[PDB]
Amino acid sequence: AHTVKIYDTCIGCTQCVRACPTDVLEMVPWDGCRANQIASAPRTEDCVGCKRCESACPTDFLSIRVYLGAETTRSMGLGY
Amino acid sequence: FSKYLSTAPVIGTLTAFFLAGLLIEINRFNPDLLVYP
Amino acid sequence: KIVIDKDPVSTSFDKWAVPGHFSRTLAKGPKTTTWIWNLHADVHDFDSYTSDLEEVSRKIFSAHFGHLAVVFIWLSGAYFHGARFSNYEAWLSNPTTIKPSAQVVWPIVGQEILNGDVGGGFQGIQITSGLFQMWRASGITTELQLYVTAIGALVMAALMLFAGWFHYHKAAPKLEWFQNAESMMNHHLGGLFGLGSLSWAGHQIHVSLPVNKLLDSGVSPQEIPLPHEFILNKDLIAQLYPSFGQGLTPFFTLNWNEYSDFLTFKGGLNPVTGGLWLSDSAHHHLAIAVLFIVAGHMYRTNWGIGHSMKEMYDSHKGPFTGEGHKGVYEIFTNSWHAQLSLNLALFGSLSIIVAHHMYSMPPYPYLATDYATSLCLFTHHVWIGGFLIVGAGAHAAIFMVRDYDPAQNYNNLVDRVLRHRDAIISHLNWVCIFLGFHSFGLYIHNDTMRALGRPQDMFSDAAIQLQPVFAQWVQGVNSAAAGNTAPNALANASYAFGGDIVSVGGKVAMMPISLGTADFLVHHIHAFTIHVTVLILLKGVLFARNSRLIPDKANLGFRFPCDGPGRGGTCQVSAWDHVFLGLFWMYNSLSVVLFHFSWKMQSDVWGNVTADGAVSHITGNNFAQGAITINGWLRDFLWAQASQVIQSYGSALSAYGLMFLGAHFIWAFSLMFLFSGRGYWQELIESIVWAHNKLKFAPSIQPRALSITQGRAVGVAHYLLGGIATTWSFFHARIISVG
Amino acid sequence: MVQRGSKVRILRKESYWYQEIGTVASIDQSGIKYPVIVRFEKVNYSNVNSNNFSLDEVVEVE
Amino acid sequence: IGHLSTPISNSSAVNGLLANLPAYRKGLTPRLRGLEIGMAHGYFLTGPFVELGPLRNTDGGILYGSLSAVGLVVILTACLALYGKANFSGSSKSKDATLWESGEGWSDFVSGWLIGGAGSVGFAYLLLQYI
Amino acid sequence: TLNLNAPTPIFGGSTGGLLRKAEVEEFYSITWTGKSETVFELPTGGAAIMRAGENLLRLARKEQCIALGAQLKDKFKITDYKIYRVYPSGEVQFLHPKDGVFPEKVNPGRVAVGSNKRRIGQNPDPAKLKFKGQETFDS
Amino acid sequence: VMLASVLFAGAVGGPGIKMKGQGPAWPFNAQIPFTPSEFLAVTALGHIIGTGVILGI
Amino acid sequence: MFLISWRGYWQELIETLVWAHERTPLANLVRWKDKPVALSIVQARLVGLAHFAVGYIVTYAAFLIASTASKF
Ligand code: CLA
Ligand code: CLA
Ligand SMILES: CC1=C(C/C=C(\C)CCC[C@H](C)CCC[C@H](C)CCCC(C)C)C(=O)c2ccccc2C1=O
Ligand SMILES: CC1=C(C/C=C(\C)CCC[C@H](C)CCC[C@H](C)CCCC(C)C)C(=O)c2ccccc2C1=O
């Protein structure tokens, strides 16, 4: 599966979650503040690798990264 | 219309129309200028 | 019902200041340099920024007036340059010997060597547009009639341009004036096409036929009376086809047989000129007019009688096809793109039909012997036609993204084609592979057989024969059709199927284009290359909304480059990218059609006739055994016939030699954009913004690389321009020298 | 300590506006990491003009 | 419903030809259905080789053409062996358990294609050079 | 749960959907309640009609379920879509909403999976992690 | 012949018209059927049929 | 062909050839073990450059030899 790592420069903008076409991402409360959020990827096996979550991140050089790893049938996006 | 002529495509064209016609008229009275004589 | 609005848009220059004023995305200012290309991309796409179909359609109507202006401006320049800068007066005295010419070149740096010895006492560029043969068929004998027509087009150009100002700024029609397709079809059929062919039929009778009757008797262009004298002096119209002495009494009393001398069905070629008989074309557009005027009284209007196109589609439904054509009228009175794509398909399909019907039935006098024009007239309208067919697959795809509605289309004929599109594409996929093997591989077989010294194993006429029997039969039913099944016609529909050699001057005007083993191969090359061009464009249309790969491809748009490197990589998935790929295949398909045409005629058809009657063609009948191998296509066509485009330096054909190499450049320059990608240059520019930011003068409009979609677009644009203009220069420099 | 309106230079080496001048729009008056909001004249490739930096990545060139 | 229902979809005039070919026919064993498949394809495959050959007007052409067609069948025995070596690894069972789904008879099918394929190539050599 | 059997929409078509991959492993099904009898585009071809329902549709990919689940939230405002993935010849039931709420909404009890306590410019060089099982982005 | 063709167009093509009763009315507001839209219809069709009939024979 | 045309045209072309193979009788029975996909993005840059570079070199070596062996 492709690896999705979320870095701490995220702001809880929730834009990469709603730009995901395969429902990989979600929002989660933050530990050290307990008010703001961060994105999280608990469903990285579903990730096709379209990098639409990077097109929606407003931070300068985006806080969520996608590294295209091994290609399963889900990440290849195959209907067969 | 004057503020239209200050825009880049027109003033990029009429000066290129000016600088070409500068070079065109030079080669009519001064033909075949290879070197400085 | 005419309904308009009075002054919706003022005539101001406030928006001439700001570029990009029309959209909410633009006019804020170019922060980067993509805005300069984002501006010129989405100007004449009125549907994106304006979200009112009433406001959109007013922009579209008045814009065709502006395009009608630039055609009239272009037509005046065709008439002015024939008036001032042409040898049209000297050409009418000797039409075979003197080459047609306009566009005198100015005495500057050396381009006054292009003003060559073109004929008589004139020096200019030998033109290949056929305006000299079109104006002779119109009857024009002096340059004053060309000069006033150039003025007549410029006042018409101002008339259309004023009408585009008026019908948007002052009196803009409402939406309901545009959705009346039945009254529009009634008016364009009888009025534009019927009266346009009725009134032109009036010109060919009163004007064209009298002067050509004396020109083919060959008196002089000076001794011939002016064409108003054939209207005033009825004794002058009585000495030639004396049926005008009875007036319009043969017309109204249905005694039409008295018009058997200027409304004929002779149907052949003129033995003096080598064009169609003008009395045929006089009878032609008269019959076309009545068919078009009668057909314009078909569709219903506010007078009750008439067909309704909405109720013809309702109850045109079978058991295979569900709800039938129910919904295609409501699609076509709301989508401006589905109207554009269909009107582009049959405008470009027609433009190749015009090319095929004009080399074989040459309509104009001394067009057939002018090999320099008949080849360029073919190759032009073929090339014009194929661009418009790609615009059909383009604008059909733009229909699918934003004008397609699933609620209006349930089980109709749009839904049922989008439901078995995997059966349509894959059966189209197979038939290209079947045709690519069994047509191109028969050349690869013939290369390998002639290379290995096995000439008895290839596909030829002295070998394993592949004779075209389904086309040779149709050559037989149309060459033996005058007198048996078209009994009134004196000769056949063309001499291309069968008939005599019409020899005007020393040269062949037309002769029967035979079909052999080579003609089986190229016509299946044409069948193959077209079916791939269909396959790319139709894949773009049917998968414009979704696929198994991207199920929301219509939410991303008609024109977006990729959905990323995931799903294996989704580059060129959109509907725009299939139009981009089909442009090369259209270029690939049509360039063989023009290579087929240019050597079929030079070897078998075009040539000279001796004083006994034997024909000696241009390339000497080498299409039969040469054009079955790719080496013969290289050795005997592309290498052997480019010997005039490269030996043209130092002569009057030199600008064809410079356009030859200069188009090899732009073609090869296009691969810099096609083969490479954007993100290289965006980090190369980052080294050049640095070397400008070092000296403190980097521009505030930040430099960007061209987009992925633009880099594809700027690469296909220079690709077609590089190869067509090479084919332009190769065709022109060849047939001017030998034909 | 940077205040609002102060013209800063960015030391974040990954940023598009690294070693470039920008004006701080605001600072967040809590303990949130990366509170410094700088507005820039030049847009990056995603055509935005702001980012959240820390005080360690900015200076006080004024 | 997921499959499209055209009027000629599920027609008994062509669903009866599919159910009676030796790939879907119920009564056959894999040795027999390899023989019936092999006898049909080897019979026509010698067709294009004797009339469209590198040598056709020879002594000479009917034998070497049919020598080429048995050359295809001995190639295609390997392809049916290699497809069975690959797609049936451990005789990989599935939901249907036919000759095509699980292996279960596959070594006999390739020999059946071998016997009937080399037969009808030689059988059609008799009807062309002789008879 | 999946509530199969549930009525398929009144569709009859689509070559482009649910081929041999579905019967061996991992097809999906999206279940919703549509508050009309209206037409909607499918990711396969375009129409069906949504039932009163309990509406269910068996799709090939999860990507095709979220694309259809976005259309029901956009055009019809029915956001009650509840996708699944099947049993013995499938893998994992109840894919979305995974914690009883939409992923763009915050929900306590979720754990930040794939989080990093560093920036991207603080990523190490790959030469420092050479010939080791560590990767240049994992923590 | 031509005057017979207007009756043949008025008897066959006459009841073929789907929309009846429209304007304009007759100029004296008379109680005459086949409103002059339809009279211009069947006479033009009668001039169409009567032309080919005359030239066909 | 591998340089100008890029991948996701062909991935959506194979997703119909996969369909036409799974629905064709007497060939529905023969099954792949590898699911057919298009060539990758990095892959057909190499494939397009290889055909480019071989075709660059094979064409000149045929021309450089035969244009000199014919005359010396
Ligand atoms: C002459 C007086 C005049 C004036 C002052 C205006 C003013 C306006 N027009 Mg109007 N209009 C006019 C005449 C005029 N128009 C004419 C003659 C037509 C028929 C073509 C129209 C049809 C029209 C439409 C459909 C629209 C406007 C619109 C507008 C508004 C914005 C246009 C703009 O800013 O771009 C200025 C544009 C240009 C300077 C480009 C003109 C391009 C010309 C027509 C053709 C150039 C092609 C040429 C052949 C080049 C070929 C290539 C070359 C290398 C050889 C502005 C109020 C727009 C509007 O109101 O939006 C709400 C709008 O949609 N006009
Ligand atoms: C000359 C270069 C070239 C060649 C050979 C091809 C070939 C093909 N293109 Mg491509 N294409 C090209 C340029 C080329 N294209 C370019 C420049 C672009 C960018 C615009 C494209 C973009 C493109 C698109 C968008 C599409 C194609 C498609 C196709 C395929 C059409 C199907 C067919 O008829 O195959 C027939 C095969 C041939 C004609 C090759 C001749 C080889 C002979 C006959 C057999 C080989 C001899 C021997 C048996 C070799 C094996 C022995 C060896 C292993 C030892 C075909 C493979 C289409 C497709 O795939 O749909 C099915 C399609 O949609 N191409
Ligand atoms: C060369 C190239 C570029 C670089 C090309 C760029 C940036 C275009 C810039 C060139 C033009 C000519 C700059 C024009 C600048 C001014 C308009 C010049 C004005 C001069 C006046 C006198 C008229 C890409 O961005 C690119 C992107 C994607 C695929 C392929 C390519 C590609 O091949
Ligand atoms: C045609 C094409 C395909 C489709 C190609 C496929 C599916 C591969 C088909 C090739 C067949 C298998 C023939 C190849 C046989 C070779 C002659 C030998 C290959 C074996 C070597 C290991 C020796 C792409 O996937 C693609 C992707 C990105 C950019 C361009 C393209 C592209 O142009």
From TrEMBL, chain C:
Q: Which residues bind chlorophyll a'?
A: H664
Cellular component aspect of the GO annotation: chloroplast thylakoid membrane; cyanelle thylakoid membrane; photosystem I
According to its UniProt record, where is this protein located?
A: Cellular thylakoid membrane; Plastid, Cyanelle thylakoid membrane
| Residues that coordinate or bind chlorophyll a 2 | H44, H67
Q: Where does chlorophyll a 8 bind?
A: H81
Q: Which residues bind chlorophyll a 5?
A: H64, H67, N343
- List residues binding chlorophyll a 28: Q475, H523
- Residues binding [4Fe-4S] cluster are C562, C571
Give membrane topology per the record.
Multi-pass membrane protein
Its top-level enzyme class, in one word, is oxidoreductase
Binding annotation for chlorophyll a 1: H40
Q: Where does chlorophyll a 18 bind?
A: H284, H357
Q: Quaternary form? A: The PsaA/B heterodimer binds the P700 chlorophyll special pair and subsequent electron acceptors. PSI consists of a core antenna complex that captures photons, and an electron transfer chain that converts photonic excitation into a charge separation. The eukaryotic PSI reaction center is composed of at least 11 subunits.
| Name this polypeptide is given | Photosystem I P700 chlorophyll a apoprotein A1
- What gene is it encoded by? psaA
